[PDB]
Amino acid sequence: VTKNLTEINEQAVATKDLHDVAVGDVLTYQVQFQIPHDIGALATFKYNQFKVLDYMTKEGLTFKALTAITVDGQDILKALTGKMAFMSSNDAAWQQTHNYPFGFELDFLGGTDPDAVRNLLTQYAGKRVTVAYTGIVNEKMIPDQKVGNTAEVSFDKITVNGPEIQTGGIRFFKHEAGSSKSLANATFILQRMNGNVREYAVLEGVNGMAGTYQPTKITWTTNQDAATRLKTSGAETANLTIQGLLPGRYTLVETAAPEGYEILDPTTDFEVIAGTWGTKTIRIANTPVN
Ligand SMILES: [Cl-]
């Protein structure tokens, strides 16, 4: 049995055991295993269960869809749909059945029509079958945490672990020049260079948030006026934080100082460090003028 993360946002990615992800990313996984050569055999059938359980013990992914079940280049999901047993972590029964924040269980022979399913699998006896599915990186995917999954295949088991995923974040502390006084209501936008194209962050799911940003998705625009205006809180230690970012270079661009202040540093260049909140909370001064 194998498990791999094969795509991010429907683009193929290189196989490795650790991937950096952004919040809102759609991750494609594949779990592959062999149909027994004697899947069709009489013992009354020898096989009455053919189960795939896939789960994560840590938060950060929401189940999206079972996308394909393929063998020998043939997608057989259309033929199998409605005949099998299936539950995911989106279903109300999941938590009490399998106490994990993410996962699914597919029992090829546990549904209403196991004979039909067994007959189909018998056409591909001894061949490798791939179950593909997607998940969505959600607002509970926090930095400083590598999270992985486990798949188990059983006929009454074999277990494998998938790759780990992680995300980045950053913290700033906007303050009055010369002191540690927290300044609320400074306005920033988040900028990056994607190749030679300057782009700005659009955060979904952050209406009503200030200071702490925990978006459900981050996309990028070349229309600067469409960028989400991020606001500092008056909090003590870090009054602007963002999570769910890919590693690399960014610029925090100050578009308005708080009332009674002027901008000192229009641009703050910084790095997101893969999988972490970064080296330190980045202090940014504003100049008092009242
Ligand atoms: Cl930039």
Numbering used by the authors: 184 to 226, 232 to 344, 348 to 481
Paper quotes:
So-called major pilins polymerize head-to-tail into the pilus backbone, with ancillary pilins added at the tip (adhesin) and base (anchor). The L. rhamnosus GG genome also carries the genes for another pilus operon called spaFED9. The tertiary organization of GG-SpaD is a tandem assembly of three Ig-like domains, wherein a middle domain (M-domain) joins together the N- and C-terminal regions (N- and C-domains) of the pilin subunit.
We also solved a GG-SpaD structure where only the M- and C-domains are present (GG-SpaDMC). The crystal structure of GG-SpaDMC, which contains just the M- and C-domains, was initially obtained at resolution 1.5 Å. Found in common with the GG-SpaDC, GG-SpaDO, and GG-SpaDMC structures is that the arrangement of the M- and C-domains is linear and nearly identical, yielding a RMSD of less than 1 Å. Among the backbone pilins with a triple- or quadruple-domain structure, the N-domain is usually seen as the most flexible in nature, and thus, in many instances, its removal from the rest of the protein is needed for obtaining good X-ray-diffracting crystals. Generally, this explains why the N-domain degrades while undergoing crystallization or does not form crystals at all.
